[PDB]
Amino acid sequence: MDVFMKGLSKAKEGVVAAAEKTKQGVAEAAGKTKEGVLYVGSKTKEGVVHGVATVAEKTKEQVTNVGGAVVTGVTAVAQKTVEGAGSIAAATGFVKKDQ
Amino acid sequence: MDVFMKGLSKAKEGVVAAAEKTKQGVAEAAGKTKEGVLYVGSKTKEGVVHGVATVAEKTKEQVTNVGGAVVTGVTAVAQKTVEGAGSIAAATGFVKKDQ
Amino acid sequence: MDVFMKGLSKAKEGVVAAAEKTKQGVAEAAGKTKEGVLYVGSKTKEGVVHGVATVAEKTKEQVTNVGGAVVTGVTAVAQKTVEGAGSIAAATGFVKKDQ
Amino acid sequence: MDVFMKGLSKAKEGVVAAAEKTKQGVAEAAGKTKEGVLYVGSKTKEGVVHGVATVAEKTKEQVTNVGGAVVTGVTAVAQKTVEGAGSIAAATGFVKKDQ
Amino acid sequence: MDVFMKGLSKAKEGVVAAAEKTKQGVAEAAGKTKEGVLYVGSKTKEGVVHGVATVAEKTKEQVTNVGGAVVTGVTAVAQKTVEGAGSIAAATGFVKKDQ
Amino acid sequence: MDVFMKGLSKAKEGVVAAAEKTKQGVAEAAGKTKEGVLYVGSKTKEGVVHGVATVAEKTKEQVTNVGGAVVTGVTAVAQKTVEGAGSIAAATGFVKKDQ
Amino acid sequence: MDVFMKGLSKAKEGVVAAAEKTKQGVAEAAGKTKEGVLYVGSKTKEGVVHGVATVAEKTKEQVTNVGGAVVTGVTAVAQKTVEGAGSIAAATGFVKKDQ
Amino acid sequence: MDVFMKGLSKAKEGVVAAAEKTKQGVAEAAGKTKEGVLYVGSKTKEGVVHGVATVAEKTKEQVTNVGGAVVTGVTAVAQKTVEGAGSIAAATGFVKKDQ
Amino acid sequence: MDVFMKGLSKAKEGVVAAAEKTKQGVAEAAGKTKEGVLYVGSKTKEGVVHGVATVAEKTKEQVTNVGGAVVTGVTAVAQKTVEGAGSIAAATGFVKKDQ
Amino acid sequence: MDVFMKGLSKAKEGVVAAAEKTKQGVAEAAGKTKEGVLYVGSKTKEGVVHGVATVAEKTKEQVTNVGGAVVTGVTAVAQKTVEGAGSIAAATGFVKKDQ
Amino acid sequence: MDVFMKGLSKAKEGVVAAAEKTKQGVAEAAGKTKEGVLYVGSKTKEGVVHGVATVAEKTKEQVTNVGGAVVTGVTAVAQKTVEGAGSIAAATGFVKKDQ
Amino acid sequence: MDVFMKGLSKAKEGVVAAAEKTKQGVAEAAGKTKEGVLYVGSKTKEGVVHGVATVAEKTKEQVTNVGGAVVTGVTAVAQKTVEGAGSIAAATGFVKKDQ
Amino acid sequence: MDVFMKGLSKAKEGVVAAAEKTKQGVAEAAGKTKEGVLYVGSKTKEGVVHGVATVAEKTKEQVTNVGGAVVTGVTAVAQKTVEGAGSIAAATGFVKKDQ
Amino acid sequence: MDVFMKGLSKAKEGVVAAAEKTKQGVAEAAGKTKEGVLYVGSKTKEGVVHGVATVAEKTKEQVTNVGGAVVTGVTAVAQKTVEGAGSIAAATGFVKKDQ
Known about the structure:
14 copies of one chain form a homo-oligomer. By secondary structure, chain A is mainly beta. Chain A has a single domain, classed as Orthogonal Bundle (Helix Hairpins), CATH 1.10.287. Chain A has strands at 3-10, 13-24, 27-40, 45-58, 65-79, 88-98. At the G-N interface, loops of G face loops of N. β2 of chain J pairs parallel with β2 of chain K. Chains A, B, C, D, E, F, G, H, I, J, K, L, M, N: It is found in: Cytoplasm; Membrane; Nucleus; Synapse. Chains A, B, C, D, E, F, G, H, I, J, K, L, M, N: Sequence repeats lie at residues 20-30, 31-41, 42-56, 57-67. Chains A, B, C, D, E, F, G, H, I, J, K, L, M, N: Its main location: cytoplasm. Chains A, B, C, D, E, F, G, H, I, J, K, L, M, N: This is Alpha-synuclein. Chains A, B, C, D, E, F, G, H, I, J, K, L, M, N: GO terms for molecular function: actin binding; alpha-tubulin binding; beta-tubulin binding; calcium ion binding; copper ion binding; cuprous ion binding; cysteine-type endopeptidase inhibitor activity; dynein complex binding.
């Protein structure tokens, strides 16, 4: 009863190798990001509103604007990022050369 | 009953190698970020509002603006970041050469 | 019953190697950041408002602006960051050469 | 029942090596940052407001502006950071050469 | 029942090595920072306001501005930081050469 | 039941080595900083205001500005910090050469 | 039940070595700083205001400005800090050479 | 939109009369009793247990006894309560005699 | 929108009369009692337990006894309460005799 | 929007009359009693326990006895309470005799 | 928006009359009693325990006895309370005789 | 928006009359009593214990007895209280006789 | 917005009359009593204990007895209180006889 | 916004009359008593203990007995209090006879 990602559970010998997120001449934007997160036997409440109550004995109008989580206005621009000749962006996980 | 990521649980021999987030000539922006986080047997409340109450015996209007979590205005710009010739951005996880 | 990330639990021999976040000619911005955080058997309350109450016997209008967590105005700009020839940005995790 | 990150729990021999956050010609900004933090059997309250009460027997308007945590105005700029030829930014975790 | 980061719990032999935060020609700014912090069996209250009360028998308007934690105005600028030729910024964790 | 960071708990032999925060030609600014802090079985109150009370039998307006913790105005600038040729900034954790 | 950082608890032989905060041609500023602090079985109150009371039988306006902890105006500037050729800033933790 | 019991809502003339719970030579017992109760726009939690958690890495048995509300042992006895001759127990709601 | 019990809402003339709980030679017992109670726009928590946690790395048994509200042992006895001749217990709500 | 019990809301003329709890030769007992109680816009916590935590690294048994509200041992006895002849217990709400 | 019990809200003429709790030859006992109580816009905590924590690295047993509110041992006895002939216990609310 | 008990809010003419708690030959006992109490905009904590902590590195047993509010031992006895002939206990609220 | 008990708020003419607690041949006992109490905009702490801490590195047993409020031992006895013939205990609220 | 008990707020004419606590042949006892008390905008701490701390490096047992408020031993006895014939105990609130 094992839960895992990117690995080995029961092996006499093992190798885990990785190369991630190599960037050259890049423009990036993000509102909310979650990377490498584990939840085990826990509660979680994010961007939550419980109760809304609007009561009036006499009035003209009543309105309500309620929101849990909101993301607006994400922009990314890139112009002429790479111009040099012979630019190289390489990523390798595992190189094995034995004699 | 093991929970894990990027590793080995039961192995006589093992190797864990990684190279991450190599950046050259980059522009990045973020509102909220979470990396390498573990929750075990815990509570969590982030960006939460519990109760909203609006009561009036006599009035003209009533409005409410309620929000848990809000992110606005994220921008990234890059211009002519790389111009030199022969620029190299390399990432490797594990190099094994034995004799 | 072990919870872990980037490691080995039960192994006769083991090696853990990593190289992370190598930056050259970069511009970065962030509102909130969390890296390498562990929660075990704990409470947590961040950006929280419990109760909202608005009561009036006689009035004209009533409005409310309530927010738990807010992030605004994140910007990053990069211009001509790299111009020298033969610039190198390298990251390696583990190099093994034995005789 | 062990909780850990970047390490070994039960191993006859082990090695933990890391090289992190190597920066050259960089501009960085942040509002709030948390790195290498452990919570065990503890409470935590950050940016919290408990109760809001607005009561009037007679009035014209009533408004409220309430916020738990707020971050505004984060900016980073970089210009011509690197111009020298043959600039090198290298990061290595573990180098093993034995005879 | 051990909780740890960047280390070994039960091993006959072990080595822990690290090189962190090597900076050259960098400009950095931060509002609030937390590094290498442990909480065990403790309370914590940071940027908190408990109660808000606004009562009037007769008035015209009533407003309230309440905030727990606020960060504003973080800026970083870098210009022509590196110009010398053959600049090197290197970081290594562990070098092992034995005869 | 041991809680620790950057160390070994139960090992016949062990070595802990580190080199941190090597800076050359850098400009840094911070509002609040916490490094290497331990809390065990303790209370903590920082930037806290308990109660707010505003009562008037007759008035025109009433407003309140309340804040727990505030940080404003953090700036860092760097210009032509490094110009000499062959500048080196090196950091190493552990060098082992035995005969 | 041991709580520690940067050390060994139960080991026949051990070595703890560190080199930290080596600076050359740097400009730094900070509002509040805490380094190497331990709290055990203690209370702590910093930047706290308990009660706010504003009462008037008859008036025109009433306002209040209350703050627990405030930091403003932190600036750092560096210009042409390093110009000599062959400048070296090195940091090492442990060098072991035995015969 | 009227909700009521034992009464009149819209009537030019009305009469409400009642005689309740007339007891003679009686024995009564009760565990929990609720009489004449109104709930309007409210929450209510009585005899509630939220969460049950039983976790063991190694053990022999584990059992749990959980209960929300429990009533036990209610008894009533009456013997020869009434022996006098001509005992009367009368109840009347409304007697109207007009001339 | 009126909520009521034992009364009149909109009537030119009205009468409310009642006679309740007339007791003679009685024995009564009760554990918990609620009479004439109104809840409007309120919370309520009575006899509540929130969380139960039982964790063991190694043990033999573990048991738990949890209860919200408990009532035990209610008894009432009556013997020869009434023996006099011509005992009267009368209850009337409203007697109207007009000339 | 009126909430009431035993009364009149909108009536030109009205009468409210009551006679309650007339007792003769009675024995009564109670654990907890609530009579004539109003809750409006309020919180309430009675007989509550929040958290239960039982943790052991090594042990033999562990048990817990937790209770919110408990009532035990209520008894009432009556013997030969009334023996006189011609005993009267009368209750009337309203007697109206006009000429 | 009126909340009331045993009364009149809007009436040209009104009368409120009551006679309560007339006792003769009675024995009464009570643990806790609440009569004529009003809660408006208030908090309330009665018989409450917040947190329970039991932690042991090595032990044999651990038990806990926790209780919020407890009532035990309520008894009432009456014997031959009334023996005189022609005893009267009368209660009247309102007597109106006009000429 | 009026909250009241046993009274009139808006009436040209009104009368409030009451006769309460007339006792003859009675025996009464009580642990805790509350009569005629008003709470408005206030806090209240009665019989409360906040935190329980039991920690041991090595021990044999550990137990805890915690209680918020406790009432024990309430008794009332009455014997031959009334023996005289023609005893009268009368209670009246309002007697109106006009000419 | 008026809160009151046993009275009139807005009436051209009014009368408030009461007769309470008339006792003859009575025995009474009480542990704690509260009569005619008003709380407005105030705090209140009665019978409260905040923190409990029990820590031992090595021991055999540890126990704790903690209590907020405790009442024990309340008794009342009455014997042959009334024996004279023609004893009268009368209570009246308001007698109105006009010519 | 008036808070009151046993009175009139806004009335052209008014009368407040009361007769309370008339006792004949009575025995009474009480531990703590509060009558006619008003709290407005004040703090209050009665029978409170803040912190409990028990720490031992090596010991055999440790126990603690802590109590906030305690009442014990309240007794009342009455015997043959009234024996004279024609004893009268009368209480009246208001007698109005006009010509």
